[PDB]
Design a protein around this ligand. Structure first.
Ligand SMILES: CC1(C)O[C@H]2[C@H](O)CN(CCCCCCn3cc(CNC(=O)c4ccc(S(N)(=O)=O)cc4)nn3)C[C@@H]2O1
Ligand SMILES: [Zn+2]
Length: 258
């Protein structure tokens, strides 16, 4: 009876094994655009992905992760609200069964079709497992997806999904350039929060870009043909793998832009 996104093991149940689910800095949240304050002391984000080394793509039973070599400073996030250097370890998405839902963050209660999370860890803690025990251990860059025109830089991901349909399957995924997933503008909102899946640790600086990327209906349909189940188990489509918005509590969301 492991956690997931079903009726019996979904987000409303997670607090029974992970009591931090009801904590003071949980993610995701609704971003109220009228309440977020412009912070002129924030810096432009520095997204340095030109030396990124992708390795593998894995269906882990709740999403698919594209994994990177983080054994040196190759793909890093710096600046904005961050102190020091955060290394890219993996990206993954959260998506819906229909285009009207799927994102984890919301914007004035608007749900997007999906949400990309680029996950980075603070190199002053030495490894990812040490970084998730610290309040400034991770930085997650969140990017909304809307359905419209295809995203050319997503198609290499879309075309490998048939090879990792079920839980525990992986495939080589070298020479993927994550710069092809970025929007034009790096304007963002930022707040302190958490991992959005168990163990829900309160270790994340969230950086959520204002500008969504556009993907095609055919691209998101391929995400929705993945399975939560293992091979030779009853088929359960991998859809609606998103946590809903959590209470903001004693937090302020800051905007990088006027
Ligand atoms: C195994 C590998 C290559 O994959 C990276 C994955 O992000 C996580 N691996 C397992 C870490 C082992 C103990 C550390 C604590 N921890 C981490 C995890 C896995 N969860 C997570 O790492 C996680 C990351 C991001 C997010 S979100 N949706 O962006 O907020 C949510 C969760 N489970 N327990 C470390 C990884 O290195
Ligand atoms: Zn995520």
């Amino acid at each position: 009876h492991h956690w997931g996104y079903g009726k019996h093991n979904g987000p409303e149940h997670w607090h029974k094994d992970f009591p931090i689910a009801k904590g003071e800095r949980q993610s995701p949240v609704d971003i109220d655009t009228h309440t977020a304050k412009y912070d002129p002391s924030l810096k432009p984000l520095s997204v340095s992905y030109d030396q990124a080394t992708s390795l593998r793509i894995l269906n882990n039973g709740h999403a698919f992760n594209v994994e990177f070599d983080d054994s040196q400073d190759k793909a890093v996030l710096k600046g904005g609200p961050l102190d020091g250097t955060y290394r890219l370890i993996q990206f993954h998405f959260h998506w819906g069964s229909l285009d009207g839902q799927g994102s984890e963050h919301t914007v004035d209660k608007k749900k997007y079709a999906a949400e990309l999370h680029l996950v980075h860890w603070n190199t002053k803690y030495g490894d990812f497992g040490k970084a998730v025990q610290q309040p400034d251990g991770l930085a997650v860059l969140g990017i909304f997806l809307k359905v419209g025109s295809a995203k050319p830089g997503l198609q290499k991901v879309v075309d490998v999904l048939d090879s990792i349909k079920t839980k525990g399957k992986s495939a080589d995924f070298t020479n993927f350039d994550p710069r092809g997933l970025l929007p034009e503008s790096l304007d963002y909102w930022t707040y302190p929060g958490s991992l959005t899946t168990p163990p829900l640790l309160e270790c994340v600086t969230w950086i959520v870009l204002k500008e969504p990327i556009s993907v095609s209906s055919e691209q998101v349909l391929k995400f929705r043909k993945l399975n939560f189940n293992g091979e030779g188990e009853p088929e359960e489509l991998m859809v609606d793998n998103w946590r809903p918005a959590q209470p903001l509590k004693n937090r302020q969301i800051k905007a990088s832009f006027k």
